């Protein structure tokens, strides 16, 4: 994983978006293309929309979802059985 010494991968674009949102102290739906960003608990009230190769999916953040990458919560593959 992203080892300790390096520090996490919290990409600058949505870092800047959330800096905007928490400097305004209001929280809105957000659209982003970055599965690869790991999570800080700063996002718990924030709301993100994330891409599935096809569309977006707005999703709300929570305490225990930290330490994860958002794509864990964006379903990539549909499978329905046979």
């Amino acid at each position: 994983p992203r080892s300790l010494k390096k520090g996490p991968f919290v990409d600058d674009h949505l870092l800047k978006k959330v800096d905007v949102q928490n400097e305004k102290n209001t929280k809105q739906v957000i659209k982003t293309w970055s599965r690869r960003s790991t999570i800080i608990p700063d996002f718990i009230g924030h709301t993100f929309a994330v891409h599935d190769g096809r569309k977006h999916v707005p999703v709300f953040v929570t305490e225990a979802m930290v330490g994860h990458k958002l794509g864990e919560f964006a379903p990539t593959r549909t499978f329905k059985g046979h």
């Binding site: 300790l4 520090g7 996490p8 800080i40 608990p41 305490e63 225990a64 930290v66 330490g67």
Partner: peptide, 11 residues
């Protein structure tokens, strides 16, 4: 759950 300590280990 102990994420306050997760991000004391992670900084």
């Amino acid at each position: 759950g102990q994420v306050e300590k997760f991000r004391r280990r992670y900084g």
